[PDB]
């Protein structure tokens, strides 16, 4: 536990060469009034100052609770130092808060998201896989005090679900699920094949943040859809029984999609001017779950599936942050 704590704290030290030098540079050139005369410069300094400020308040805990621990924590935990060992619980909490902060703060990360789950090849098996995936995300939402709004659900004929599109709203939703987005691989002995040979099926997970008058048509099938024709992507809703609400819901999803199409394209263009495989796998035979990206493996698949692993997500988030 102590070792773990130390490790955690080491990350915090990792942002000491950033904070000091940066701060010095800012005061030396940016703080100046004759530099200030240009707005852009001022803005830059403010951004730079923000970095400094984060490092100030949260490092104290790392330093202050570390140095004061060892004198009283050494020999006694149970008698007289039962406060003094769970005094470092506070430190742990602080550390966690810091880490989480580092992970988040990035563009659109607070605004809720609407993940579509798409199956892969396998046909019947694949649909089941999709369903399973959906279930896990639902449980994650449940776990994390969220409220899920079920928009698209479409059953596959032989078994399972073909297509789904599920929208959760609450406290930093997108942030958590934004990494997941991509292919999830189901490496397990099919219940449908009599042979019981191991199979591999897949699932895309499209995850997007939530964020014309004659070039859209709205058609009823009490069901509803909002087909923005110029781009050419449709959305279809079936959540509520009341029509107007459903329509409204559809509208927001479509809007989100529009934004998504724009932003990614723009980014690509910029890159032009200037993962390969599955992200995750779940290997039920082996009781074994490798995220291929970020090199973590959980050995209780069931736990992961029942309710999605926050820890894994955090790791993924960290990786994403680093890449950013």
């Amino acid at each position: 536990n102590a070792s773990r704590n130390a490790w955690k704290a080491s990350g915090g030290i990792f942002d000491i060469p950033q904070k000091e030098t940066r701060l010095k540079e800012l005061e030396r050139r940016l703080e100046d009034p004759s530099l200030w005369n240009d707005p852009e410069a001022a803005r830059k300094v403010s951004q730079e100052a923000a970095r400094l400020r984060r490092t100030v308040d949260t490092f104290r805990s790392l330093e202050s609770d570390l140095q004061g621990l060892l004198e009283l924590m050494e020999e006694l935990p149970a008698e007289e130092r039962e406060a003094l060992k769970p005094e470092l619980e506070e430190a742990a909490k602080k550390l966690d808060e810091l880490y989480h902060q580092t992970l988040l703060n990035f563009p659109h990360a607070e605004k809720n998201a609407i993940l579509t789950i798409q199956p892969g090849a396998g046909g019947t098996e694949a649909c089941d896989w999709a369903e399973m995936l959906l279930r896990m995300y639902t449980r994650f939402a449940e776990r994390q005090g969220f409220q899920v709004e079920v928009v698209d659900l479409t059953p596959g004929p032989e078994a399972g679900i073909d297509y789904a599109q599920i929208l959760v709203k609450g406290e930093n939703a997108y942030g958590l699920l934004s990494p997941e987005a991509g292919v999830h691989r189901l490496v397990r002995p099919s219940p449908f094949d009599a042979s019981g040979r191991r199979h591999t099926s897949f699932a895309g997970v499209e995850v997007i943040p939530e964020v014309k008058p004659e070039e859209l048509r709205i058609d009823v099938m009490s069901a509803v859809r909002v087909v923005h024709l110029p781009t050419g992507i449709t959305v279809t809703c079936q959540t509520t029984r009341s029509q107007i609400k459903n329509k409204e819901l559809a509208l927001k999803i479509l809007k989100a999609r529009l934004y998504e199409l724009e932003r990614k394209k723009r980014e690509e263009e910029l890159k032009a001017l200037r993962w390969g495989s599955q992200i995750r796998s779940y290997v039920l035979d082996k009781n074994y779950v490798k995220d291929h990206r970020t090199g973590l493996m959980r050995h209780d698949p069931e736990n992961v599936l029942d309710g999605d692993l926050m820890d894994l997500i955090w790791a993924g988030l960290e990786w994403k942050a680093g890449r950013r």
Binding site: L23, L26, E27, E31, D32, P33, S34, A49
Partner: protein
């Protein structure tokens, strides 16, 4: 002659990041002013901002006289709040008693250009109200 009040926490040594060389826009050096501030501080508590007159003469040696601690900070300190209010009329974040305000008022009397402390108290109350705290 270049007199302006513009600074932060007195106790923290050499606060160059918030304002810093604005006082040093004129011919007086950055080192001096900071030093002066530091000197001033030892007579009073650290952590709070303070304003001071900046009469920048041609000789490069400047006269200076402190004023009372910022109205706002003082007001806050009796309240026991960091963030005062965002949207105060819609919901109250905190509140103050009048006696405390009155007490606060009396200690500033030297810098406060007024004889009646009652007036000062009422001003303080008004300020508090503005901030977002129903007396």
């Amino acid at each position: 002659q270049a007199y302006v009040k513009l600074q932060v926490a007195a106790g923290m040594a050499n606060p160059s990041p918030p304002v810093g060389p604005a006082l040093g826009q004129q011919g007086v050096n950055i080192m001096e002013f900071c030093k002066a501030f530091n000197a001033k501080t030892d007579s009073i508590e650290k952590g709070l901002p303070i304003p001071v007159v900046i009469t920048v003469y041609a000789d490069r040696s400047f006269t200076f006289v402190t004023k009372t601690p910022p109205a706002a900070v003082l007001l806050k300190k009796a309240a026991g709040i960091k963030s005062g209010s965002g949207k105060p009329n819609k919901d109250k974040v905190g509140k103050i008693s009048r006696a405390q305000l009155q007490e606060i008022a009396q200690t500033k009397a030297a810098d406060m250009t007024g004889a009646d402390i009652e007036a000062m108290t009422r001003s303080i109350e008004g300020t508090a109200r503005s901030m977002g705290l129903v007396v």
